[PDB]
C-alpha cells in the first residue's frame, strides 16, 4: 500500500516548508504594504495618492498691456 499509493515523509515535509515560506513572505508583504500606503497618503511624497495641481504650462509669460502684470 505504501509503495503503490503514497510517498515518503520527506516530500510532504519539504512541501510544507515551501508552503510556509510563501505564506509568511506574503504576510509580511501585506503588512509592509499597509504601512507604505499609510505613509504615502499622509505625506504625499510617494508616487501614490498624487492629486492633480494646475499645469504651469498654461501660464502666459508675455507683456500684459500694463507693466506690473
Amino acid at each position: 500500500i505504501a509503495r503503490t499509493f503514497y510517498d515518503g515523509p520527506e516530500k510532504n515535509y519539504e512541501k510544507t516548508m515551501a508552503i510556509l515560506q510563501i505564506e509568511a513572505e506574503k504576510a509580511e508583504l501585506r503588512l509592509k504594504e499597509l504601512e507604505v500606503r499609510r505613509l504615502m497618503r499622509a505625506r504625499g511624497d510617494g508616487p501614490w495618492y498624487q492629486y492633480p495641481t494646475i499645469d504651469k504650462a498654461l501660464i502666459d509669460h508675455s507683456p500684459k498691456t500694463t507693466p506690473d502684470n
Partner: protein, 57 residues
C-alpha cells in the same frame, strides 16, 4: 510681514508737463519721433522691473 518702502515726497518732484490733452495729441507724432530714446528706456525699465519705485530716474 514687513514694511513697505516708499520714496519721500522730495524724490517724487519734477518739472511737470502742464499742457492739456489736445496739445499733447497735436504734438504726439513728432514727440514720439524725437523723444523715442528716453521713452523706450523708461518703458523697458518699467516692464522689466514691475515696480514703479525702481524707475523714477
Amino acid at each position: 510681514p514687513g514694511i513697505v518702502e516708499l520714496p519721500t515726497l522730495e524724490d517724487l518732484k519734477v518739472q511737470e508737463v502742464k499742457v492739456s490733452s489736445s496739445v499733447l495729441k497735436a504734438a504726439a507724432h513728432h514727440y514720439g519721433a524725437q523723444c523715442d530714446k528716453p521713452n523706450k528706456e523708461f518703458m523697458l525699465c518699467r516692464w522689466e522691473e514691475k515696480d514703479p519705485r525702481r524707475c523714477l530716474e
